[PDB]
């Protein structure tokens, strides 16, 4: 008998407005959106060669992780459009009970968090030359302390911090207010205490208690309102306090909703399909996307590279000049709208380095070898040193000279594509240009983030001292990976970061935030698909002729969840390899 | 068909006049209110009291009944507590007609009579029930057809309405999103039982009294609030009944019914009943 | 309460409902839908689903479990009835073989199906998992080229279009057991180098002339080798170098 | 350890679950079996028994 069941597969709603009830079902688009948003049919994983090559449809699943992440972005993409009045809230309820009503709401806490960071970013630009803050604020980890520690006290001692928020709206509602604002006076008095109290060396972003215990106190002194003094030891037991309503359900132990995230797990666990639901969602609400469909092609594959004499940064021009076509062909209509702030333009060297910033290749001292890193010039000859001065001048030029007073982003890109010699200095300067804006978000998207911190094909002799590198080039010295290597989502006002880890080429490769020295909280372990969603997978494919089914296989959908434990790739082998027929 | 003001509605529909006050519509039942028995269920103490006194949570209801009494004897707005249109528009007809007919109303505190008989004064909700699938505004909701009913957990307090068709927006446009969200909408009706010495008397022009004396000194009403939904993605990792313990209140309560005016309210309405029903409307 | 006070003070105004739920067909409501940036882009495919979406909302299960116990999606009733569809079908994959071929000591446990019985003629030095791979990357390639690729590869043979006509009528063909039992229905060699063959010898001899020819092909890799021969049997229902060999032999018998 | 992460190839894997088809009780139970001795093919056929 063949009186088999049918089943519904697709969400009733469109893509911008899903809820938990549609987590299992699929969405659809034309096949043209690939070429429209992703150049030359390169996408995350193998969705083009395998799933699209047969189905001829750009069908996408919804993941538990995917929609939950998309929840956080919709707040960021609403606080911008409709900000909040601090005063009108506390009118409603007493100043005695703020925590149980105000702080612990999901729609209020981010509206507070989302604002304090904007004030923080404005000041960090002063503390960028310092080598120390490169070590602490490369991550978002210690940011979320300083922004939350202010808010936790608002539940404890509102009578000492509540006046700050209230008059901040007086300052915003007062035009002809030339002086700085309260928070931009607050955070300055914080960071000065960091340099004076913290330990210069051995100061880590990944470790909290070592940072708090090195800072016994904050000491604020506002002229108008406050001289409030703080003890940090009380927030040492639980460095990661976060409101229950978000965090039982947002993502497992996920904390930085504004900064970023990271997806790790076994092969085919589903990570390289979640962000595909995000990247498309990112466009249909007109939010900028920075695609990096695979870092394997940048770090574990041949591309031309050239070194600068001052800096160890190996310039790449052909690589950037191909990527920008992808960033352009997708986000063309927005960049025309976007002007430039010429006070920011024109500080990036041709090799990517910036004036104010620390040296991107400092002289390191390997203690165990008892030798410096600069010593590699002993093996050089006279002629090369003479050639270096000839290159030191030829590569001296910057883009500010030949390109003055543009109007949009494309004016930099159309010049960048047209001339190979200035691709990098056009690439990086766009990143400042998108990063300092208040018209459009930033979304930094990576698949294969693991490949970066791994060694590279790119050879050299100067890194022979590192027994791990073994005569290779790290990509934090390669120019183009610098744009995206830094897990700096907090730096982006109205921004977010998403990273993943591909392990198809590896077998049983345990990857996680212990392999990469990486803070806790900002990561999410993947796990396989549940049953009822693993059911519609089969019925979705059978309707679309992806895999060809025996009558033995049409109702094996709830059986293969044993055979796969909810894993995607362990099914695709069966679906395509027909290993069932052996048993 | 056209936009109408607050007072013009009364001046158009309260034109009628009648000599007999008992024949005239009027919600506040002077005489013959019945002591209702307190029902008790499982899912009633879950949200009705949450880190609060059972009484002080009810004392607010004991107060909001009061200004409603004054609001009838005194044409006022600030006193008039938060309540629906379709009752007020049908409750003030029962009052303002007496003002047009020459009758008068006054609020009286009969302390002695309430001391002559009957137990003390106090509010006790004798029925608390949750419902799902509907909103407090009586105009979004459709007929009995499209809704599918689950009368399973009536014994404990729950009823669930689920739609078969697509609901419209302000613009008159269907959605698929709106149906899904409507299936979450929970309302909390409560039937109160508050004995009171304060009463009302009608007094004809040059008449000390024209209404009968009350026997009850007990009066009832219904309050409702459409609740805030839980966090997103909380339904997933929880049992159903453990998920309803997490709805929370921020919207104010809303008087609906009063002394079995209209025999208690109904959310569903036939097609004609919706047409005769009016709602306040903005444009842009 | 803001909207109330405005209406109380005669700031904002009132009128009847323009919105009323009239019985209409599923097609007419398409006019009044609220579509977003995505249904617009792919109209032809979604526009036929609004007819189906709205139909399913009528037929919903009133079961307690899908709403009141844990998270889950309402299902039909066939999902419970057809639970035996696998167990009843997997046997039929095996019912081709008579188990009397295989009742020896502890061989049935390792050789019960047809696919378990081809391999040992092809095993080299005890490797089985390898042979299981090479045969499947080949047979899987057969099904794929017939479905998605062109047929210039399939220009030579004659049974080409006649084979897809046998696929689409029966999804049973994707069982490799049924792919080849079909091939062996063509090829039941009753006689060979002159001797009568019992059923327990007729089956054996058919396979060696396959396994031998797999080793005689010129192509290097087994994947390339093994494909070419199944094509000679699948895509020549009447003909083959191996089948014309057989039909050559009946003439020797009938004349003698 | 996990099922796909110990028995990698599927012919090692269908053997252990060949009874589970014959039962038709799929997903009803939770399995935890501990094995030590021999090689992979011989280590799987024990799981049938």
């Amino acid at each position: 008998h063949h009186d088999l069941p049918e089943l519904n597969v697709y969400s009733f709603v469109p893509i911008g407005d899903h809820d938990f009830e549609d987590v299992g079902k699929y969405t659809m688009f034309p096949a043209t959106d690939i070429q429209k948003y992703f150049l030359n049919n390169q996408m995350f994983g193998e969705y083009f060669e395998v799933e699209f090559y047969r189905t001829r449809k750009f069908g996408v699943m919804i993941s538990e992780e995917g929609a939950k992440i998309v929840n956080h972005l919709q707040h960021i993409q609403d606080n911008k459009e409709t900000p909040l009045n601090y005063i009108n809230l506390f009118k409603r309820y007493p100043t005695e009970k703020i925590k149980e009503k105000i702080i612990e709401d999901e729609d209020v806490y981010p509206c507070l968090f989302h604002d304090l960071a904007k004030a923080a970013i404005e000041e960090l630009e002063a503390y960028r030359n310092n080598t120390l803050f490169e070590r602490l604020f490369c991550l978002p980890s210690l940011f979320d302390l300083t922004i939350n520690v202010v808010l936790r006290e608002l539940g404890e001692n509102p009578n000492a911090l509540l006046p700050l928020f209230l008059k901040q709206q007086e300052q915003i509602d007062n035009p002809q207010f030339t002086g700085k604002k309260v928070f931009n006076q607050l955070f300055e008095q914080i960071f000065k205490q960091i340099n004076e109290r913290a330990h210069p060396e051995f100061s880590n972003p990944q470790q909290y208690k070592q940072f708090l215990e090195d800072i016994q106190k904050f000491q604020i002194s506002i002229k108008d309102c406050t001289e409030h003094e703080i003890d940090l030891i009380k927030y040492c037991k639980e460095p990661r306090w976060i409101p229950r309503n978000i965090k039982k359900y947002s993502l497992r132990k996920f904390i930085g909703f504004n900064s970023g995230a990271l997806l790790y797990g076994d092969s085919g666990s589903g990570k390289s399909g979640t962000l595909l639901y995000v990247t498309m969602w990112a466009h249909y609400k007109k939010w900028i996307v920075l695609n990096v469909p695979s870092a394997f092609n940048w770090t574990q594959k041949e591309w031309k590279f050239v070194r600068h004499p001052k800096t160890g940064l190996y310039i790449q021009n052909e690589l950037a000049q191909d990527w920008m076509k992808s960033f352009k062909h997708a986000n063309s209509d927005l960049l025309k709208q976007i002007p430039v702030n010429m006070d920011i333009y024109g500080f990036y060297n041709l090799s990517g380095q910036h004036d104010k910033e620390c040296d991107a290749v400092p002289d390191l001292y390997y203690k165990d070898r008892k030798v410096n890193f600069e010593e590699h010039k002993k093996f050089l000859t006279e002629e090369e040193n003479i050639i270096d001065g000839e290159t030191n001048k030829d590569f001296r030029v910057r883009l500010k000279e030949k390109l003055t007073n543009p109007l949009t982003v494309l004016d930099i890109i159309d010049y960048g594509l047209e001339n190979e010699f200035f691709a990098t200095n056009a690439l990086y300067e766009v990143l400042e240009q998108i990063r300092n804006q208040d018209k459009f978000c930033v979304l930094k998207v990576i698949d294969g983030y693991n490949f970066m911190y791994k060694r590279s094909i790119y050879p050299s002799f100067r890194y022979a001292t590192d027994t791990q590198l073994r005569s290779t080039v790290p990509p934090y010295h390669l120019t183009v990976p610098r744009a995206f290597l830094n897990f700096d989502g907090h730096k982006f006002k109205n921004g977010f970061v998403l990273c993943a880890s591909s392990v198809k080429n590896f077998h049983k490769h345990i990857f996680g935030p212990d392999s990469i020295d990486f803070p806790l909280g900002y990561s999410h372990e993947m796990r396989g698909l549940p049953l009822d969603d693993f059911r519609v997978m089969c019925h979705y494919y059978l309707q679309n002729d992806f895999w060809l089914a025996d009558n033995v296989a049409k109702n094996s959908s709830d059986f293969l969840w044993m055979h796969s434990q909810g894993n995607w790739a362990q099914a695709h082998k069966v679906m395509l390899g027909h290993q069932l027929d052996s048993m | 068909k056209e936009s109408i003001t607050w007072d013009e509605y009364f001046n158009l529909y309260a034109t009628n006049k009648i000599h007999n006050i008992s024949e005239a519509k009027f919600p506040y039942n002077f005489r013959g209110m019945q002591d209702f028995v307190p029902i008790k269920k499982e899912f009633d103490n879950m949200i009705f009291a949450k880190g609060e006194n059972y009484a002080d949570f009810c004392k607010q209801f004991d107060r909001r009944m009061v200004w409603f009494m004054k609001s009838l004897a005194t044409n006022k707005d600030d006193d008039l507590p938060y309540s629906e249109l379709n009752f007020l528009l049908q409750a003030k007809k029962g009052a303002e007609l007496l003002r047009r007919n020459g009758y008068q109303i006054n609020l009286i505190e009969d302390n002695e009579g309430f001391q002559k008989f009957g137990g003390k004064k106090g509010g006790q909700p004798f029925e608390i029930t949750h419902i799902m699938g509907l909103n407090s505004n009586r105009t979004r909701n459709a007929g009995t057809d499209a809704y599918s009913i689950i009368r399973d957990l009536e014994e404990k307090g729950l009823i669930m309405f689920i739609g078969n068709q697509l609901k419209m927006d302000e613009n008159g446009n269907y959605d698929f999103k709106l149906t899904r969200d409507d299936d979450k909408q929970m309302i909390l009706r409560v039937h109160y039982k508050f004995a009171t010495p304060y009463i009302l008397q009608v007094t004809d022009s040059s008449g000390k009294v024209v209404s009968p004396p009350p026997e009850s000194y007990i009066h009832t009403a219904v309050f409702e609030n459409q609740l805030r939904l839980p966090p997103k993605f909380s339904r997933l990792d929880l049992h159903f009944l453990d998920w309803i313990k997490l709805y929370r209140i921020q919207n104010e309560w809303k008087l609906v019914d009063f002394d079995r005016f209209l025999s208690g309210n109904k959310l569903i309405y036939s097609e004609k009943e919706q047409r005769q029903l009016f709602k306040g409307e903005k444009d842009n | 309460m803001k909207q109330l006070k405005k209406i109380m003070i005669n700031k904002t105004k009132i009128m009847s409902n323009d919105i009323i739920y009239i019985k209409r067909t599923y097609h007419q409501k398409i006019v009044n839908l609220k579509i977003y940036n995505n249904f617009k882009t792919e109209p032809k495919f979604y526009n036929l689903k609004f007819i189906e979406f709205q139909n399913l909302l009528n037929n919903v299960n009133l079961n307690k479990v899908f709403y009141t116990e844990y998270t889950s999606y309402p299902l039909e009733d066939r999902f419970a009835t057809s639970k035996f569809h696998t167990f009843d079908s997997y046997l039929t994959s095996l019912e081709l073989i008579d188990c009397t071929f295989l009742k020896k000591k502890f061989n049935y446990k390792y050789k019960y199906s047809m696919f378990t019985y081809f391999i040992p003629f092809l095993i080299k030095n005890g490797k089985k998992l390898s042979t299981i791979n090479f045969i499947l990357k080949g047979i899987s390639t057969i099904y794929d080229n017939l479905k998605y690729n062109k047929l210039s590869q399939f220009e030579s043979y004659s049974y080409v279009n006649q084979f897809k006509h046998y696929i689409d009528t029966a999804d049973d063909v994707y069982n490799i057991n049924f792919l080849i039992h079909w091939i062996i229905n063509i090829y039941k060699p009753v006689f060979d180098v002159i001797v009568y063959l019992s059923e327990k010898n007729r089956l054996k001899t058919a396979y060696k002339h396959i396994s031998t020819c797999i080793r005689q092909d010129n192509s290097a890799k087994l994947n390339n080798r093994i494909t070419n021969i199944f094509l000679d049997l699948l895509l020549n229902y009447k003909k083959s170098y191996l089948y014309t060999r057989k039909m050559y032999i009946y003439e020797q018998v009938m004349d003698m | 350890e996990i099922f796909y992460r110990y028995f990698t190839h599927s012919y090692n894997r269908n053997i252990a679950l060949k009874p589970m088809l014959l039962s038709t009780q799929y997903c009803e139970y939770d399995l935890h079996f501990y094995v030590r001795g021999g090689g992979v093919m011989g280590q799987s056929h024990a799981c049938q028994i």
Binding site: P530 | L236, D237 | S72 | C27
Partner: peptide, 29 residues
């Protein structure tokens, strides 16, 4: 019943819920 849910997102159908040809030959013989 027909279906019951074990736990979060795990639906399964529940399972814990005169030959004539002989009638002839028994007559003939």
């Amino acid at each position: 019943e027909k279906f019951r849910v074990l736990a979060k997102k795990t639906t399964i159908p529940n399972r814990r819920l005169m030959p004539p040809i002989e009638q002839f030959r028994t007559y003939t013989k």
